[PDB]
Amino acid sequence: SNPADHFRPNLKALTLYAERQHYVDRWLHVKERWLAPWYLPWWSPLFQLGTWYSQRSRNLFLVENHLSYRPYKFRRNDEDRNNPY
Amino acid sequence: STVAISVQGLHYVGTGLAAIALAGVGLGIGTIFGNLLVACARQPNLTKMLFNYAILGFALTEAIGLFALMLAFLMLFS
Amino acid sequence: GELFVRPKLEEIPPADQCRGFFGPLNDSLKFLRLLDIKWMMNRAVAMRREYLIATPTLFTFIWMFTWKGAVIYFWGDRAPPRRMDWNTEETGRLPLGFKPTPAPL
Amino acid sequence: MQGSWSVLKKNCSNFFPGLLAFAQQTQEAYGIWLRIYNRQQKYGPTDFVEQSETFSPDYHKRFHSQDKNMWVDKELCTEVSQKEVARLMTYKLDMWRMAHCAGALLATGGYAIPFGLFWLANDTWVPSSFNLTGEELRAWREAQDLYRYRSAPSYLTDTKWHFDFHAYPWNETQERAWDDLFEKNDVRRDPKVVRPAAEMYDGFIKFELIRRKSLRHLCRSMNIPTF
Amino acid sequence: MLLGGFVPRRFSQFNRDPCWMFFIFSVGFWLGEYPAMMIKYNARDLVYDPHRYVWSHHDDHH
Amino acid sequence: VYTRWKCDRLPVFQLKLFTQEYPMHAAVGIFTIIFLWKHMSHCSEETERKYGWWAGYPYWRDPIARRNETKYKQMIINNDVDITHPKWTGCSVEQLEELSRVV
Amino acid sequence: EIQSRKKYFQTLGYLVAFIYLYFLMPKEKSFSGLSGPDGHWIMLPKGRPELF
Amino acid sequence: MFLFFFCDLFWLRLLLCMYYCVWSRLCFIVYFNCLMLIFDFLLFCLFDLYLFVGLCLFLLLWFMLFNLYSLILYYCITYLNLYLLFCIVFLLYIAFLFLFCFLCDFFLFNNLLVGDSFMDVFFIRFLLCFLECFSLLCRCLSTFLRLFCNLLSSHFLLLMFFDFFYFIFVFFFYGVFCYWFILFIFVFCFCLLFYVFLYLLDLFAAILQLFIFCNMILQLIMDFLLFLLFV
Amino acid sequence: TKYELKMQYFDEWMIRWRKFQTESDWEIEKGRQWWRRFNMAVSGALFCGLVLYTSGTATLKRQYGLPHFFDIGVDGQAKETMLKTLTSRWRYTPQGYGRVLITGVPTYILFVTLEHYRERRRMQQYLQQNTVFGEQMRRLLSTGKIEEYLPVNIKATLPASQQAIYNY
Amino acid sequence: FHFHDVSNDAIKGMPPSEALHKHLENAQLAHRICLAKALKAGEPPVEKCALTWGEVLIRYQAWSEYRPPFQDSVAQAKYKKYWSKKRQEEDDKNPF
Amino acid sequence: VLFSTYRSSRLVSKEFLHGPVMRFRALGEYYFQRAWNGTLNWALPGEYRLYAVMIPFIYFYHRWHNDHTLDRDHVEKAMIMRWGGTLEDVRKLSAKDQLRVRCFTDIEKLYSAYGPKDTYLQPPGDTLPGKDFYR
Ligand SMILES: CCCCCCCCCCCCCCCCCC(=O)OC[C@H](COP(=O)([O-])OCC(O)COP(=O)([O-])OC[C@@H](COC(=O)CCCCCCCCCCCCCCCCC)OC(=O)CCCCCCCCCCCCCCCCC)OC(=O)CCCCCCCCCCCCCCCCC
Ligand SMILES: CCCCCCCCCCCCCCCCCC(=O)OC[C@H](COP(=O)([O-])OCC(O)COP(=O)([O-])OC[C@@H](COC(=O)CCCCCCCCCCCCCCCCC)OC(=O)CCCCCCCCCCCCCCCCC)OC(=O)CCCCCCCCCCCCCCCCC
């Protein structure tokens, strides 16, 4: 135990936390702001690169019909194997 | 009945078993050098070259022991 | 290892000489060549087109080692439980007396 | 050459006249190319017309073969004059650079405008039609020559180093040819002395086996856009 | 690569080069910190913490 | 004579190095970075308590609770959230007042 | 000349960084709470009542 | 979660800036074989077979600045994590593999089908091809595992032995003044011998492990190289 | 019109509030998936056709000539038929950048156009829905902002065993 | 008022939807109790009821994300394929 | 046109900070630019004195950091847990008492796996406080 503790980074300075929802929403707002202007047509490769893959992935998530339960990604406690909630 | 039992000392046993792996590794290394001598007395002009290969062999063979040793530590420190 | 030279048209043995799982699929059995995987493998080896056997394998491994492995691990569907929580199909519908907003026009 | 404000003003002033001239040159060059292409398809060898495949011996990758995929039309003077061929070559260079710029515009929509400002500030990648006077044309040619100077030595060094590191000439005459091929321009090279290097290198790397990095250096030296 | 440089023949020569002067100072620190620990941690008046059984790292990591 | 390493400035050489010398390696690295930040950028509170602190989690002050309290206070104050709304409490305001008078 | 000046400035900057890191910078998440930050949340929404 | 931390190389970066503002020749390289792939003259390769030299040199420098200096007490190997090493090896190995695959030459994989036409294709050759395709990925995994395990085991052993030496030196040196002084002197001499032996072993093993780390990558590259003969 | 910028917020919200996904919305998404696959298939077919048409004559002769892998007889007949059909008339056979453009630009345009108009179709479908998702879509297009916790505000239907929270 | 039992033993034989809803209800009950105490004391609610509100928020996020699978042809086929009679008998036999 | 891509576009004069730069280069070059200073992959020099100087310095600053920043956390945790479970409780002690406690922690560190186990295992019948003393 004590010997194992010697293999840690020794210059940790600061830790910041952010919810996935929050920064995903902020990123989407940035993307909408930069892809909104008229001088970037929807058929341009840049616009499709920005939008199509995200749309496809979100559609795949929505279509999902799984017989098992996937525990919430951001639970308070994910260390207990016998408690998915 | 249904009991969730947690024994603590078992992590020693497993650890010891992992060390048995070294019994091969060690032996294997010896074999290499054994042949090395029989190869240096059979063509000494290549000694240096042979030595290099032996070292390569040692480094590959030793690697395996480390794997086992890692497991021991994992179980010995958990 | 060494350079590979494709065989000439005259150096390629005839299809009738190839063997399947049990035996050659000669006349009256030619259409079974499509279904016999071993016959196709032997034919590919005979024609020096061994890549048809090797390329799909390696790529598949890569595809598993790179992209599908993690997808199955993180997003795959585990085995269903014994007592299953089916959907009653009651959720989502708007309540009685609700006045939905008009659609764009 | 580096970008400058004077060149930016020059190219912004002559932007639309340059585009109109480029369009006229495009029509003329299409006519010339149509004549040449019809003649090639009609009187060309079977391998040249059918685009015979030549694969490398190591990785079996197709590339143009100098013997089979290139054909000199000895009787082209009847249909097309020398000046027309020169016009077509110049237009091909201008059209390549314009095509790359247009592709960037279509790809990035309106976000290419600042990059267009960087583009018009330098004569390296603008068409020759943007110059409406002798002095402007001279400066444009100076920019092209500067790019050639920048790119050529890398190509020459790549070729020479790879050969010298992995092979040597067979005989003394080949040795002299190879050594004299890569002399600086301040001395005059005798073509008769240097010619055997062509066969010596044909033994090493034909045009069909040219590597991608060497090709990039060559296209840089030829003022051909590479991105 | 250990190719060359000043190499003192004996202890008395460590003072013939500033770098080896710093080295011998550091060696003095290294070797002299052990006697200090012997004196400090084997002292007569050193007393174990009365509350040493209140908490230990062993129960924490377990 | 012109060389990329000697004549170009550092950002330009960086772009050239990772675009015309090692483009595949850069692509794979970016792929791996995206994967790491998509699947290995989360830590639960229990995980932090078990492993997130050098000497161990100081339960005697519970800094995680204070951090969350600051977070939620900031969100409520900035977003003008009415935490007494029935959806948060599961009961009407009048029932809440009745409960307050009871307890 | 250029590299000498650049490396001189880089050396000074690295020296300052080294001193701060190994002699002034506190380690985060201290047990006692006397030194270093315990972490905090960022990118929280602001002025979005409809979000809740 | 975003953790802000720093590597343990800042002093070494300072020394690099101080000592390499001026040019110096390099004549000793841990993995020299990346520079000499071809040994028979008149053989040449159209593939960019020297592309690995720069990455090899930088990787050697980085791993040496970390691993070799880690023998100094309290020096930290900042990157010592299993999955981080997996990421590094994944980058290098998969990048070169994708370089060979993007070539779109399927004949390059003909050698994967092991054996000759005499061997049964489905029951022998195809199973050997399966095993070889598996072995490529296993080589990647073994490379990164071998690099991680060596460092971890060596440093665990060093820490434990140092702890034992501190214990006996501090709490049993008084025996020098006692009648059992000979036992303590024997033990102390044994500990000094063990100290020197461990340090020498670690110094050799670090360099050798870097050599093998680069050798695995170069072996991946060499397995798919084809050489033409000048005529 | 750029529907993706509007629809990304809606899709993220639906994922966050997927509990209230009726079977109708699920069918809508499945139809979107099916149409995406169909668009991929047709675009790939167009790309293959353009590649085949622009292929060199020698390339076609090698590809659709002897030997025959199976040698059944139908294989040879089909290969000869295709080879004759392609080599009968004159074909523009560009190389390099030109073949890239000819083969790719039509494919990209077709795929992008089909996908964009299917996105518009999905937006209309969700507009016509009589579920909470449809109401959210209408509110999004009206006010321009996604109203989270809408299902619990307007008291969207819940299973009989989970209506206690609405009991106020 | 009464808190639901969401212990591991109770949770083991429960559907995911029921467990999530019970957790949400427990969070709401705790939040309303804390708010009632704050109102009785007269102090502001935000200065006392922030953590309980956050717990309600996180339970809402976990509760709204889960959509029980629809019972259709493919889902029923998968369930019947995995849960054969042999597997059901084996599950019954196992005491764990 | 805005920024040059060439390193030749100078931003300062050739003589800017010439003196300090020359002193810095003199410091760098005196010991390193020598025939016997042949490095192994730029990391291990041939000059002995570089080792003799840099190994002690690296150890010294690493040890200072470890003693004053890293191990201090464990020491403070032991003090807090064994003497009240709160910082104020520890501060209620005098500096001498804290010194005694910290030195006992050092003792435990030096024993580690080889010292007596009665430093943390309470023998039966011992009269000293147990784990439930403050609970
Ligand atoms: C609106 C939607 C947009 C979609 C998104 C697009 C995104 C941008 C990508 C680029 C798009 C093209 C940009 C315009 C290029 C200009 C036109 C052109 O081809 O120039 C000829 C020229 C030909 O080059 P080459 O090397 O000589 O060709 C060798 C051939 O053997 C040459 O053959 P040859 O030797 O026999 O000689 C023939 C020559 C003989 O002719 C002549 O000599 C006369 C001159 C003719 C050409 C003139 C070009 C002028 C260019 C400048 C235009 C003015 C710009 C003004 C700018 C300022 C404006 C204010 O004539 C030709 O050049 C013909 C070439 C073949 C035609 C290519 C066009 C095909 C696409 C168009 C049809 C699409 C239909 C859609 C249907 C939809 C169905 C569903 O093109 C180029 O220089 C190549 C483009 C360079 C940039 C490449 C960038 C990467 C491309 C990747 C594309 C991948 C697929 C798409 C998806 C991308 C996703 C990532
Ligand atoms: C109206 C006009 C007419 C209509 C339009 C017509 C069409 C126009 C478009 C087409 C034009 C084409 C021709 C263009 C030629 C010029 C190109 C060029 O740039 O030349 C260099 C050009 C100068 O050219 P030059 O002086 O003429 O020299 C040319 C020589 O021949 C030297 O030549 P060279 O060959 O040596 O130079 C080449 C160099 C060109 O590059 C450069 O020179 C670099 C330029 C940037 C340098 C920046 C340095 C300064 C950095 C400052 C940082 C910030 C400082 C602090 C600021 C504080 C502010 C408060 O290297 C490259 O070519 C590298 C290419 C790399 C390609 C990267 C591809 C990535 C692909 C990704 C992977 C994908 C894989 C597939 C995945 C598939 C997955 C499915 O550079 C500049 O002028 C530098 C400008 C710097 C601007 C300020 C710094 C950035 C400001 C950013 C503001 C952001 C605001 C928003 C922020 C929002 C935050 C939320």
Ligand SMILES: CCCCCCCCCCCCCCCCCC(=O)OC[C@H](COP(=O)([O-])OCC(O)COP(=O)([O-])OC[C@@H](COC(=O)CCCCCCCCCCCCCCCCC)OC(=O)CCCCCCCCCCCCCCCCC)OC(=O)CCCCCCCCCCCCCCCCC
């Ligand atoms: C809220 C609290 C504040 C924090 C906010 C943070 C916001 C975060 C947003 C969200 C981000 C999420 C993702 C995070 C992922 C992190 C991953 C990570 O850490 O990986 C480990 C990894 C460790 O890398 P490494 O191996 O240690 O090497 C990186 C080192 O920087 C060394 O590498 P290198 O040496 O190769 O680097 C090149 C180096 C080459 O060498 C040098 O240039 C030497 C200097 C080195 C400086 C950098 C090292 C820093 C050392 C520690 C700090 C130094 C002391 C600071 C004192 C602070 C006092 C409070 O050159 C530079 O560093 C260029 C900058 C030079 C600046 C010089 C300034 C001179 C000013 C002179 C003024 C004079 C005024 C006179 C007025 C007179 C009036 C009369 O970190 C990174 O790779 C970088 C991560 C950065 C991610 C982006 C973060 C966003 C930007 C935040 C900027 C905040 C600015 C505001 C702060 C204000 C004070 C509170």
Ligand SMILES: CCCCCCCCCCCCCCCCCC(=O)OC[C@H](COP(=O)([O-])OCC(O)COP(=O)([O-])OC[C@@H](COC(=O)CCCCCCCCCCCCCCCCC)OC(=O)CCCCCCCCCCCCCCCCC)OC(=O)CCCCCCCCCCCCCCCCC
């Ligand atoms: C050149 C490169 C070389 C170097 C390689 C270097 C790398 C190593 C190689 C290995 C790869 C390493 C991995 C690196 C990471 C790359 C990314 C990655 O892995 O992403 C996977 C990732 C996996 O998806 P995911 O994110 O995990 O999500 C899973 C969901 O399934 C996603 O759902 P979704 O909504 O996105 O839809 C996906 C859909 C994708 O598929 C579709 O959307 C529909 C089909 C698309 C067809 C595309 C065109 C094909 C050609 C059309 C026809 C041409 C000829 C026309 C003329 C004919 C004349 C007669 O797939 C499915 O869902 C499966 C549907 C299967 C239906 C089967 C129905 C039964 C009947 C048909 C089969 C049985 C027939 C028996 C016949 C028996 C006869 C006796 O993405 C995908 O695979 C899907 C999106 C991309 C689709 C691209 C479609 C084109 C593919 C290329 C085709 C042509 C080249 C291959 C042949 C070459 C021959 C020379």
Ligand SMILES: CCCCCCCCCCCCCCCCCC(=O)OC[C@H](COP(=O)([O-])OCC(O)COP(=O)([O-])OC[C@@H](COC(=O)CCCCCCCCCCCCCCCCC)OC(=O)CCCCCCCCCCCCCCCCC)OC(=O)CCCCCCCCCCCCCCCCC
């Ligand atoms: C923001 C936009 C994002 C875009 C995303 C899309 C990707 C990027 C787009 C394009 C980017 C620009 C650059 C592309 C590469 C340029 C390559 C190049 O320089 O070629 C020059 C070359 C010109 O030189 P050339 O001398 O005229 O001819 C070449 C020589 O023959 C050469 O002679 P050779 O001796 O080298 O001969 C060998 C040659 C022979 O080939 C050729 O050169 C012929 C042309 C290619 C034919 C490919 C079709 C083969 C047959 C497919 C059959 C599929 C059946 C499936 C049925 C399914 C039924 C259920 O190569 C091969 O043999 C390679 C065959 C391909 C093997 C593919 C293996 C894939 C393995 C898949 C692994 C697993 C994947 C994941 C799992 C998926 C499933 C779950 O160009 C071409 O030949 C054609 C270029 C076409 C460029 C791509 C056009 C892109 C259109 C995009 C449409 C979709 C957009 C989607 C957007 C989404 C929203 C944003």
Ligand SMILES: CCCCCCCCCCCCCCCCCC(=O)OC[C@H](COP(=O)([O-])OCC[N+](C)(C)C)OC(=O)CCCCCCCCCCCCCCCCC
């Ligand atoms: C190419 C091969 C190189 C081989 C070099 C061999 C060096 C031989 C060193 C001999 C002994 C040196 C003793 C130093 C004592 C310092 C003071 C001290 O107290 O230290 C005690 C420390 C630790 O001793 P300790 O463990 O007894 O400390 C006790 C402290 N308590 C009780 C608190 C725990 O000594 C060391 O750690 C020295 C180990 C050196 C191992 C060799 C490292 C080589 C790799 C780094 C090379 C750096 C070169 C840089 C050059 C510039 C690069 C650009």
Ligand SMILES: CCCCCCCCCCCCCCCCCC(=O)OC[C@H](COP(=O)([O-])OCC[N+](C)(C)C)OC(=O)CCCCCCCCCCCCCCCCC
């Ligand atoms: C305590 C637990 C310990 C567990 C330890 C487990 C091991 C962890 C090891 C971590 C370190 C090593 C990581 C090595 C790298 C692994 C890579 C990997 O598997 O990542 C896969 C993952 C898969 O991504 P994904 O997980 O988002 O997959 C999406 C699939 N659905 C939507 C169905 C859920 O890749 C990524 O994360 C990167 C994705 C973005 C970059 C690629 C985009 C292009 C995709 C092309 C195909 C599809 C689009 C169509 C074509 C293009 C059109 C423009």
